Amino acid sequence: TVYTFPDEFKLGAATASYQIEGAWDENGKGPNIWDTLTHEHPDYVVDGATGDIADDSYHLYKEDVKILKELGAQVYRFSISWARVLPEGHDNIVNQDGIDYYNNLINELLANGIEPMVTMYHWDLPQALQDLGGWPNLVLAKYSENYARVLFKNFGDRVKLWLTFNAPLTFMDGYASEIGMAPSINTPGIGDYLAAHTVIHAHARIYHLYDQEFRAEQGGKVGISLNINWCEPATNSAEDRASCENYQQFNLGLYAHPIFTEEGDYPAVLKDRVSRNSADEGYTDSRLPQFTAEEVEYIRGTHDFLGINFYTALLGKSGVEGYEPSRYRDSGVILTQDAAWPISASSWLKVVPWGFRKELNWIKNEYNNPPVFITENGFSDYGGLNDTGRVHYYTEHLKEMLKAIHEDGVNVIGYTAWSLMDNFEWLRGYSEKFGIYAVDFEDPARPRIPKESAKVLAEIMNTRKIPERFRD
């Protein structure tokens, strides 16, 4: 039983637009902040890589569907490129080529018995909107509503699973470093909080839009994908436990407390620690933006499920470190990783499968057991088809998730592996491989070929259980 997937549980794989599509300026697509970063600042990216071609999924989407069908995916999670649909960011011009592209992909999936799950925003903001300040500027919440309306109108007759945003905890950091994630602006502890605030408002507008304009007709579900690491106390002390609770609230709770609790608003510890630190540094006003009571009520409850991107764990101990001002410093935890944990090709990603079960329980307890869809989970290496590390990563994480479901009563409803194929890994370029299919980026045809992990995942998807040879 503990090794079998529930009958209705959905298994599949995931990608994101900039990471796979290419065709960055083809057929009317406008520029986004990742076009800008990779073109203007190749020094920020391993190898000076760009997403100009990537997996060429703009042209090769039928090949993506073919490998999804081979894998036996029930669901394909992909994102829509805002600037491919609305090249100016604003909704005055809709690019028919972009509409056609996503319709073609959706229709191809459905014809092959694969359900589309669509992320509206996976980090590729139109440059025209960044030029207004991007996410720190609250005007983007209405712009995001208008973008979502175009998506619901054009695609919602066939798409029944939506994510407003992907991993805003990560993309907000594009406002916390001059050399980091797009748009690479150095406003740590100030602009990243403003970005989060706008994202939360935008998410809520999109959910209410669905309720008002689309749900009765379309009957789908709208969630948000939040990334979160487990944070294990470095020792069993109450002080180290407090630091790990701080971590959860400053990383997951920042987004999930406003949306997924009955109370709404930011977590108290976030409000209070930032208020205190801001006062002590001489600011008249807290660096953390505020919601009014009306906004708190508007935002809370704006969910049909919770998407989670889970990869790894950290150790947390009591204390404060980091630069003033910064979210890490504000969070009141000292973070490390255990040298004993298996490594990957990504400095931040260690293999800690039991952390997944701990995180799922933390979520269950904090948010009253929301339906949870694992929208990403996966592992990096530098190359190779005999990807034993990736196979082990998947089989262990899936076992831990199944324990969370069967032993712990966590309402996990689906899981999409990150990623269907090797792709553009942001500032790491093509150097870090997350795919279950390999892609030859030196071959203009970008063939996708299965790794051992794709074969094992296909076996899991076909049999709906963890094979005996991977059991404890």
Q: Which is nearer to ligand BGC, 124 or 265 (CB)?
A: 124
DSSP string, 423-464: ---GGGTTSSB--SEEE-TTSTT--EEE-HHHHHHHHHHHHT
| Residue 235 touches Cl ion, criterion: CB under 5 A | yes
Give the one entry of ligand BGC, Na ion, Cl ion, none that residue 400 binds, where binding means its C-beta sits below a cut-off of 5 to 8 angstroms depending on kind.
none
Scan residues 137-196 and list those touching ligand BGC (CB under 6 A). Answer: 166-167
User: What Å distances lie between residue 434 and 170, 316, 412, 422, CA to CA?
Assistant: 17, 26, 23, 5
The yes-or-no answer on residue 376 being catalytic is yes
Q: Which two tokens stand for residue 460?
A: 């899991």
Helix/strand/coil for 151: helix
Q: 290, 209 in Cβ contact below 8 A?
A: no
User: What Å distances lie between residue 157 and 32, 120, 160, 373, 469, CA to CA?
Assistant: 27, 16, 8, 21, 42
| Residue 425 touches ligand BGC, criterion: CB under 6 A | yes
Q: 106, 50 in Cβ contact below 8 A?
A: no
Supply angle C-alpha 422, 428, 432, rounded to 5. 40
| Residue 124 touches ligand BGC, criterion: CB under 6 A | no
What is the Cα–Cα distance from 435 to 421, expressed in whole angstroms?
4
Q: What minimum distance in Å lies between the beta carbon of 428 and ligand BGC?
A: 8
Q: Which is nearer to ligand BGC, 227 or 251 (CB)?
A: 227
Instruction: Pick the piece of the chain touching Cl ion (CB under 5 A) from 35-43, 91-99, 233-241, 371-379.
Output: 233-241
Give the one entry of ligand BGC, Na ion, Cl ion, none that residue 274 binds, where binding means its C-beta sits below a cut-off of 5 to 8 angstroms depending on kind.
none
Instruction: Pick the piece of the chain touching Na ion (CB under 5 A) from 90-98, 111-119, 227-235, 428-436.
Output: 90-98
| Residue 309 touches ligand BGC, criterion: CB under 6 A | yes
Which position among 63, 245, 376, 396 bears the catalytic label?
376
Give the one entry of ligand BGC, Cl ion, Na ion, none that residue 1 binds, where binding means its C-beta sits below a cut-off of 5 to 8 angstroms depending on kind.
none
Q: What minimum distance in Å lies between the beta carbon of 85 and Na ion?
A: 9
Q: What minimum distance in Å lies between the beta carbon of 32 and ligand BGC?
A: 14
Of 212, 443, 444, 469, the residue at the interface with Cl ion (CB under 5 A) is 469
* Beta partners for residue 326, in sequence order: none
Of 46, 53, 91, 94, the residue at the interface with Na ion (CB under 5 A) is 94
Task: Locate all alpha helices (DSSP H) within 125-221, ordered by sequence.
Answer: 127-130, 140-155, 168-171, 191-209, 215-218
Q: Which is nearer to ligand BGC, 307 or 370 (CB)?
A: 307
Give the one entry of Cl ion, Na ion, ligand BGC, none that residue 425 binds, where binding means its C-beta sits below a cut-off of 5 to 8 angstroms depending on kind.
ligand BGC
Q: Which is nearer to ligand BGC, 118 or 167 (CB)?
A: 167
User: What Å distances lie between residue 126 and 31, 105, 264, 366, 378, CA to CA?
Assistant: 6, 22, 30, 35, 28
Give the one entry of ligand BGC, Na ion, Cl ion, none that residue 38 binds, where binding means its C-beta sits below a cut-off of 5 to 8 angstroms depending on kind.
none
Neighbour count for residue 267 (Cβ, 10 Å): 22
Q: Which is nearer to Na ion, 102 or 305 (CB)?
A: 102
Residue 180: alpha-carbon gap to chain centroid:
17
Q: What minimum distance in Å lies between the beta carbon of 432 and ligand BGC?
A: 8
Buried b / exposed e along 294-306 (16+ C-beta atoms within 10 A): ebeebbbebbbbb
Q: What minimum distance in Å lies between the beta carbon of 19 and ligand BGC?
A: 6
Q: Which two tokens stand for residue 437?
A: 């299919």
Q: Which two tokens stand for residue 329?
A: 């410093």
Q: What minimum distance in Å lies between the beta carbon of 165 and ligand BGC?
A: 10
Q: 352, 339 in Cβ contact below 8 A?
A: no
Q: What minimum distance in Å lies between the beta carbon of 163 and ligand BGC?
A: 10
Helix/strand/coil for 205: helix
Give the one entry of Cl ion, ligand BGC, Na ion, none that residue 309 binds, where binding means its C-beta sits below a cut-off of 5 to 8 angstroms depending on kind.
ligand BGC
Of 24, 291, 373, 418, the residue at the interface with ligand BGC (CB under 6 A) is 418
User: What Å distances lie between residue 191 and 134, 160, 198, CA to CA?
Assistant: 10, 33, 11
Q: Which two tokens stand for residue 427?
A: 């500032």
User: What Å distances lie between residue 25 and 75, 120, 370, 372, CA to CA?
Assistant: 28, 19, 40, 36
Q: What minimum distance in Å lies between the beta carbon of 469 and Cl ion?
A: 4
Q: Which is nearer to ligand BGC, 166 or 184 (CB)?
A: 166
Q: 82, 35 in Cβ contact below 8 A?
A: no
Scan residues 332-391 and list those touching ligand BGC (CB under 6 A). Answer: 376
Number of residues located near ligand BGC, criterion CB under 6 A: 10
What is the Cα–Cα distance from 212 to 38, expressed in whole angstroms?
39
Q: 436, 417 in Cβ contact below 8 A?
A: yes
Q: Which is nearer to ligand BGC, 102 or 434 (CB)?
A: 434
Q: Which is nearer to ligand BGC, 218 or 312 (CB)?
A: 312
Give the one entry of Na ion, Cl ion, ligand BGC, none that residue 94 binds, where binding means its C-beta sits below a cut-off of 5 to 8 angstroms depending on kind.
Na ion
Residue number with the smallest Cβ distance to ligand BGC: 309
Q: Residues with catalytic annotation?
A: 376
Q: Which residues bind ligand BGC (CB under 6 A)?
A: 16, 19, 166-167, 227, 309, 376, 418, 425, 434
Q: Which residues bind Cl ion (CB under 5 A)?
A: 235-236, 469
Q: Which residues bind Na ion (CB under 5 A)?
A: 94, 150
